[PDB]
Structure 1
Amino acid sequence: LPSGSDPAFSQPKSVLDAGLTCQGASPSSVSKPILLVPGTGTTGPQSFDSNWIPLSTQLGYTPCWISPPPFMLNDTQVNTEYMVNAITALYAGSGNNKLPVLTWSQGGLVAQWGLTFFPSIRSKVDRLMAFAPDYKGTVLAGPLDALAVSAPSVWQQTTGSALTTALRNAGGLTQIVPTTNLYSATDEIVQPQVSNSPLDSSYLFNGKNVQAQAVCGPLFVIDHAGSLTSQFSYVVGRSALRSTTGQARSADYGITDCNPLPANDLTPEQKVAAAALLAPAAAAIVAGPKQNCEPDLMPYARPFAVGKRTCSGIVTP
């Protein structure tokens, strides 16, 4: 695992601060905060206001979130800057107290990239609850890369990319802080997720890796969005955030919790919204930026991906 000082921010602090927002609070005077990191093609509110913003409020947290522009479609290394800055702020603002991080899809990759390359936040992050994280990218993005219709983060979230290679070689496929990874074998966006083994994109060594079908059986189907919004997902998330081990406890969930529909504590209005979670995301992707190469790795990550090819050529130290 990398050590030493944190790499410098490529973006101005003022820009990173504008991306951070808390519900009913300022990061400089927030109480019991929880940082939420959105998925690709969405903003914090787009990913969570129909699910984890109201759910985490009910658990006694002040939900905060980052909205890296544009809709998490730009360089993942930059999106990570919004998070690193957010954690530094919230930690100090809550009176120097560790806080939990809750992510969805790419947000999980962003969280792990930050923990791996920015040492200073490892002691500030209490635990990590990731839903459908793609630490190893996805094979499904492959075709889009070929047709040159992929946004910067889509290339990076491609299996075998320079980014996911750098994460692996840096030691990021093993938890850094207590981590729970809830995911589904029936994920239409992120694959492979079928083996319920280290072969899965969402698997982290030493982590509490929870594949939905391992607990609920093969006929339990929850897609990329259901992994975040479902009643079962809620029961595992609540377990993870309350747990004294920092990870969800098997004793806290089971077969009786195998409900694929949006969490019960959501209003009828929120459930409908949670059900159409993918619509805005797909729209943003379809209309967003496109390129025929993967964005270059920043200096700090280059030694870990020697030989891979990015927009400027073959990576070298």
Structure 2
Amino acid sequence: LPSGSDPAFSQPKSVLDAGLTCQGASPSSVSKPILLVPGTGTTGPQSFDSNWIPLSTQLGYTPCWISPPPFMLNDTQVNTEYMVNAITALYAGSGNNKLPVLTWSQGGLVAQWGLTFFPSIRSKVDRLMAFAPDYKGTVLAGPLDALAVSAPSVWQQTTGSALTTALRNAGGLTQIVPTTNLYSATDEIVQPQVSNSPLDSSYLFNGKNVQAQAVCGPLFVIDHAGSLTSQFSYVVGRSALRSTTGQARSADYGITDCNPLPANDLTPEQKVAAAALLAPAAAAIVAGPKQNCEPDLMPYARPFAVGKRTCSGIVTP
């Protein structure tokens, strides 16, 4: 696992600073903050204000989020700089206190990629609560790439990419901070997720990997957005955030919690919105950036995906 000094950011900090926001507080003076990293095609609010912005608020957190432009459709490596910048600012901003990271979809891959290649933040993140993270990418994007209708981070999230290869090769498929991964064998976006083992895309060695059906049964069906918004997710979500061990506890959730509807504590307006989650996402993808190659990896990661091929050609250290 890499250690040492962090790679430099390719982006100006004022730009990285532009990407962060806290609900009713400044990053420099925010208390009990939680960082929220959105999925492909969305801004922090589009992903979380019908769900975890309101939910982390009632559990006593000040929701802060990053919104890398354009809608998380860009080089995952750059989206990560926004996260590193934010954590650095909030640990500082809350008095050099560690902070929890809550992610959705690509956001979990960003959290892990930063924890892997930017050693400084390992001591600032208290725990990682990840909903439907695609650490091995997704087998479902095959069409999209042979289809070359893909935004940079779509190329990077396809199983077999130089980026997911680099993450596995650098040792990032193991938990760096106490991590709880909540996911569904019935995810329509990220696959595979059916074996309740290391083969799943959401799985991290030593993490608390919660495959929905392994708790609720083979008939329990929750989708991609419902992995983030459901009532079952709130119960494990809250367990992780309250846990002394940093991961969700079994004693905390059971069969009674196997409710797939949006969380009970949401207003109806919020529940409707949470049910409609992928709409803003799908639109942005159709509407935003495309390309026929995977963006090039940054120097710091090339030696971990040597031989793979990106925009420029074959990868060499």
Residue 108 of structure 2 corresponds to which residue in structure 1?
A: 108
Q: Give the total of aligned pairs.
A: 317
Instruction: Please list the CA deviations of residues 249-291 of structure 1 after superposition, one character each: whole Å capped at 9, or x if unmatched.
Output: 0000000000000000000000000000011100011111111
**SS in structure 2 at match of 1:255:** coil
SS at match of 1:301: helix
The residue number in structure 1 matching 2:54 is 54
Deviation per CA, 1:120-161, whole angstroms, max 9, x where unpaired? 000000000000000000011111000110110000000010
Question: Partner residue of 2:266?
Answer: 266
Moved over 3 A (4+): none
Cα separation, 2, equivalents of 1:242 and 1:88:
22
> Tell me, what secondary structure is at the counterpart of 1:21?
strand
CA RMSD of aligned residues (A): 0.3
Name the CA distance, whole Å, in 1 between partners of 2:140 and 2:237: 27
Q: Secondary structure at the match of 1:251?
A: helix
Tell me how far apart the structure 1 counterparts of residues 76 and 257 of structure 2 sit (CA, whole Å): 34
SS of residue paired to 1:257? coil
Which residue in the other structure is 1:230 paired with?
230
Q: CA deviation at 1:211?
A: 0.2
Moved more, 82-91 or 140-149: 140-149
Report the Cα distance in structure 2 between the residues aligned to 1:74 and 1:144, rounded to whole angstroms.
Answer: 16
C-alpha distance in structure 1 between counterparts of 2:100 and 2:197, whole Å: 25
Separation (CA, whole Å) in 2 of partners of 1:148 and 1:282: 16
User: Helix, strand or coil for the counterpart of 2:296?
Assistant: coil
Secondary structure of the corresponding residue to residue 28 of structure 2? helix
Shift of 1:231: 0.2
Unaligned runs of 5+ in 2: none
CA distance in 2, matches of 1:199, 1:140: 15
- C-alpha distance in structure 2 between counterparts of 1:283 and 1:300, whole Å: 33
Identity percentage of aligned residues: 100
TM-score under structure 1 normalisation?
A: 1.00
Report SS of the residue matched to 1:256.
coil
Q: CA deviation at 1:310?
A: 0.1
Structure 1 Cα separation of the partners of residues 242 and 314 of structure 2? 45
What displacement does 1:218 show?
Answer: 1.2
CA shift, 1:219, in A, is 1.1
Q: Please list the CA deviations of residues 209-264 of structure 1 after superposition, one character each: whole Å capped at 9, or x if unmatched.
A: 00000000111111000000000000000000000000000000000000000000
- Partners in 2 of 1:295 and 1:76 — Cα distance? 9
Local SS of the residue matching 1:295: coil
Q: Under a length normalisation based on structure 2, what TM-score does the superposition of the two structures give?
A: 1.00
How far the C-alpha of 1:33 sits from its partner, in A, is 0.3
Provide the C-alpha distance between the structure 2 equivalents of 1:213 and 1:284, rounded to a whole number of angstroms: 31
Distance 2:56 2:115 in 1: 23
Q: Distance in 1 between matches of 2:286 and 2:250?
A: 39
Name the CA distance, whole Å, in 1 between partners of 2:303 and 2:99: 31
**Deviation at 1:104?**
0.1
Write the distance in 2 (CA, Å) between the matches of 1:238 and 1:147.
40
